[PDB]
Design an enzyme around this catalytic site. Sequence first.
Site, short mmCIF file in Angstrom:
data_model
loop_
_atom_site.label_atom_id
_atom_site.label_comp_id
_atom_site.label_asym_id
_atom_site.label_seq_id
_atom_site.Cartn_x
_atom_site.Cartn_y
_atom_site.Cartn_z
CG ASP A 233 -2.26 2.38 5.97
OD1 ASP A 233 -2.82 1.77 5.04
OD2 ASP A 233 -2.11 3.62 5.97
CE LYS B 227 -0.17 30.12 1.95
NZ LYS B 227 -0.63 31.45 2.39
CG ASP C 25 -5.03 -2.39 4.10
OD1 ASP C 25 -5.05 -3.10 5.12
OD2 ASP C 25 -4.62 -1.21 4.10
CG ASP D 247 -1.84 1.22 1.26
OD1 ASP D 247 -1.84 2.02 0.30
OD2 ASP D 247 -2.57 1.38 2.26
F1 ALF Z 1 -2.71 3.99 0.57
AL1 ALF Z 1 -4.08 2.87 0.76
F2 ALF Z 1 -5.43 1.72 0.94
F3 ALF Z 1 -4.22 2.75 -1.02
F4 ALF Z 1 -3.93 2.99 2.53
#
Ligand code: ALF
Lengths: 979, 292
Positions: free
Chosen positions: A675, A466, A679, A336
Amino acid sequence: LDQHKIPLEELCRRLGTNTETGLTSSQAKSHLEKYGPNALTPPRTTPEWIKFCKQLFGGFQMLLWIGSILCFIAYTMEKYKNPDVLGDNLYLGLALLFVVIMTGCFAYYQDHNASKIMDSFKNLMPQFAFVIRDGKKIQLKAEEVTVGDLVEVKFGDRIPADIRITSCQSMKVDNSSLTGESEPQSRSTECTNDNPLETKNLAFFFTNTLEGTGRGIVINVGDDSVMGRIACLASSLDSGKTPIAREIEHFIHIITAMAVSLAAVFAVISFLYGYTWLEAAIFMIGIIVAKVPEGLLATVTVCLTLTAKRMAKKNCLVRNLEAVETLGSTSTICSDKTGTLTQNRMTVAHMWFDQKIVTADTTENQSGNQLYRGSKGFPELIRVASLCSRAEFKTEHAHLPVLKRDVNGDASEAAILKFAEMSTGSVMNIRSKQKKVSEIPFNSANKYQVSVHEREDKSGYFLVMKGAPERILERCSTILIDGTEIPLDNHMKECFNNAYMELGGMGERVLGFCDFELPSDQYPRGYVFDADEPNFPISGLRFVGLMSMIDPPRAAVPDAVSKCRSAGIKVIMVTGDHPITAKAIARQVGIISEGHETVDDIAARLNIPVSEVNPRSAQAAVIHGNDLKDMNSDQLDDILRHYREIVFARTSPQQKLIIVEGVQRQGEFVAVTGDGVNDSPALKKADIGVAMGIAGSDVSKQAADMILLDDNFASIVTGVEEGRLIFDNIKKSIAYTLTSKIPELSPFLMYILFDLPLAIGTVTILCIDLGTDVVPAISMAYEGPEADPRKPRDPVKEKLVNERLISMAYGQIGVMQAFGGFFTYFVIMGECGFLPNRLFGLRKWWESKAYNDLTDSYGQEWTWDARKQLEYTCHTAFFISIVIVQWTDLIICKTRRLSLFQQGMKNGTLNFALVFETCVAAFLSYTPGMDKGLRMYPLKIWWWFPPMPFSLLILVYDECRKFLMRRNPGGFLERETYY
Amino acid sequence: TFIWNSETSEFMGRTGVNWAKITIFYVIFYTLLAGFFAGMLMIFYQTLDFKIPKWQNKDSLIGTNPGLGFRPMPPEAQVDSTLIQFKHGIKGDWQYWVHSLTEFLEPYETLTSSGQEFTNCDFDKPPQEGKACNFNVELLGDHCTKENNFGYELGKPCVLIKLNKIFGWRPEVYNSSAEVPEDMPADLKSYIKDIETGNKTHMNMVWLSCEGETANDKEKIGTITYTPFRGFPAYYYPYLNVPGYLTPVVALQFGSLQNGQAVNVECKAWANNISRDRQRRLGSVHFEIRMD
Ligand code: ALF
């Protein structure tokens, strides 16, 4: 589901909803009874007792079930045919039963996956805020909310349920539980694309909305919401069987195959030899106790435990014991981007100033090169970067280092503030030396930041400004170059776009910086500035430069991905971000090798149709989620095999499961490192799921088989080496405890083929497998590596037990243990009176209590007691002979390709184990009391020596072969003896 | 799924040449392994005295406690039992027991007829070194003779009993009628008193005593006639494996035995350095006799 596409009225008539009152109480009751989960349904679970009970049965325990029962029947036959028979088969019957339970309890501890991922969703959405049902706002419970119900979300209230955004202003939510990225996303009551996951028109179950009020009708509640589906699908998922477990089950199937085949054969040559029912019964408990290793499955469980204890000392916690090894047999490791391969800390990387681009340090420990501080444009730019209405740190986290300090503002406003704080050392000094008198906040269309700062000499006013570089390109008439204000010409505009598009080339979000000096005469001291109607120049300012921001990798990451790809393990990015950002990080970390171009890059260089560009020509891949959605398993397996550095971007949480299931189609063992909540399916489906210990969510920890408490991605490489090391060490414990089975078995088959009095007793056998040969077998978990298995069997693509191991355990080395054992049996019988010529053919009379005067070869006559006393002494001597020929067995199993003199005896447990082997044997055979159930008698000091010559022969033989096999590499000798 | 793959050789693990290689390797491995084992056995053999045990007397596990053994013995394939079965009368099954008893007593008649090294020993005559003390068959009376079918004819069977020949054993016999322990049957105590009153030399011997095991077997066995001395003598016993050794035997004679009724007997030696136990059968023997 196309409710986001259809207009609000269509959904209202679909659900009977009102845009002003939503629903009534009766309709609410009706919707509740129709479906009222509004939460994640608890998962089906099986009790511990049934899992333990089915773990009591196996291949090595079912046989001990038949063995334990048989001696129970044997004791019954003796008792009712001899009322005064002592208890020997009954206590042996109990003993074998205890082996079933103790080994049926070691297996349970190995597979004790404690992952209550459903109970890990403790957050959910407590204290629902407001609902417009019945024309009144009710601060009702978390779950009562149903479909067709108008909800009232505000700031940070965790959107109650999947709502079709109906009305909102300044609405930004963070679906960080959907794509991992926590950056705010502005939501509007208008569908932007067909895919419902990427529309501003739809909210979601799990978003801790940052700001923007919001009104929506609940499309669904739980088990059908996007988060609801994932939690249900994450809960109802199992990896199957871990690679080490599959090998162990294969190992059990092989040994049970011979054991049940040998016992079946010897139930035929027994009954055809005249053995009575009791004689066969007493015999059967011999050839199914010697064969099955009672202390092997327990040994492997402890061996995995020791290396999990050692690997946890490197801040690598393990939840499942068998999951320690499967980082060694893995070959494809998904990953990831945000949170795992990157710090999740938007930080500046590249700076545009004086027509120059240089990289800025991004390491957490700040070990980068600060070579740009001497640049002339550095002080003005950081002054503009600091004085641009800025943000602020926190007092309660002041004591933490500057990078660990919390901020208030957007991620972009945070990045500039840390960089200015890191560069100038303390910008509060600039705050003190430069007071603030005016400021303009970020809007939603112009989104600029104008502020007025009193000049230090108190002579004029300073303007800071900015914004998006394109918007301030027209608002700038001059550009600062090398400390000189240069008017903006055609060359600068082309150069501006060149750097601007180059900066966006690496996906780094950018924002321009510019300033202007207000004249003193027109704006003297005390000048009043109007914010609603500006009284200062807004356009034609002095351009300064461009700031860039990108989520950078950690320090350990670039090395880890380089070593993982060097150990045969391919790495695939599986993110949820846009392909441009994914491609930038993937190239940076080392997933995509430098000089390797995808189809789009190659076609871009050739300026030709990417379609005509041969796929082979390209090496990497940036496959987008939309493309991944409409391709089936056929093409998916092709791109997984054709390329080797694929980077999957913009993938929904359910698409990561498709990827992992796609990779597992090739027969590989996938590993997923993540994380976030998104996922969680991948962590549960992969053979080994590694999470993050600090930057990881609660569910990601509870749905993972390993935790990196230190977040150091370099611990994956160490896990690979330790995973491949424990696999080989386990194999060297199997090849050691399998060499005891033929010296244990041989007296029994020598007892029936020829009629020899028994050499080894069944109770004596239990003192080997469960006794002495436990600590040395445990000790092999401490053995260090020899050479490298990186090239030979890169992902350990081999069986745990194979024909070479059996031929080297049940064959060569094992036989030389039986001959050594029997040489001591013949020595004592010959020395005490029974010459070998008399021994053969003596089985019938030896056991029989009818003959109280059986004669030896010198004319003596032994009673039944003195005969049995002599036999039990040989039982002890065979035990010690097996132990003594096991010293050499351990030493020659310590190594596998290198000679002992090269490796060196430098394993503390092993040297202690050898002392433990002898001491237990010596203690169990030289203390008054163990001739009373263990059938163990003191031995003459001269009866420990007979097996020693066979010990030396084994050592000389193995080391000799090693020299031959290390020589003549690939020689048939190695082809048929290298286990 | 056979997956036999015989077309590309592959005899389930290898080709023909590979199997030939592994087979010759295994054959030679086992050949020199057996050679090593046989060499070690020969090396052990060259350190053995084939006439005298390496460990004798008390050093071994044979110990200093001998045990008795009834000679008639059951038939082969009945090695589990200790039962002697026969039907008295002309039409009886006496033949096996009679023939076995005749075969056992064969050395006591043939070689004793010449007796080149045999010595006519006696209580006051110690044996000469390398000479086995004689044991005349006529010393077993007339009833325990093959001529009278060894007593298995008239319904009065007679069963021989012998001591274990523990090498180098040195029996110690009671030197008084008060030294004798308790638990000895009153018959043997009266016999000891008679011997002590008579010739004092005859008390130097190991004393036998047969009695029923089960409480009812005490009264279902009837009287017992120890036709030779009531116990073995004490001038045979330093065994030392003299060639042509003849073990002394005490011949029982079951004068009164009820037909069709089983009797279990247990006979124990009585010497000071001899233990007795009803379970391990130390210093005693157990045989069962039943007449139909
Ligand atoms: F960066 Al991801 F699920 F794609 F935590």
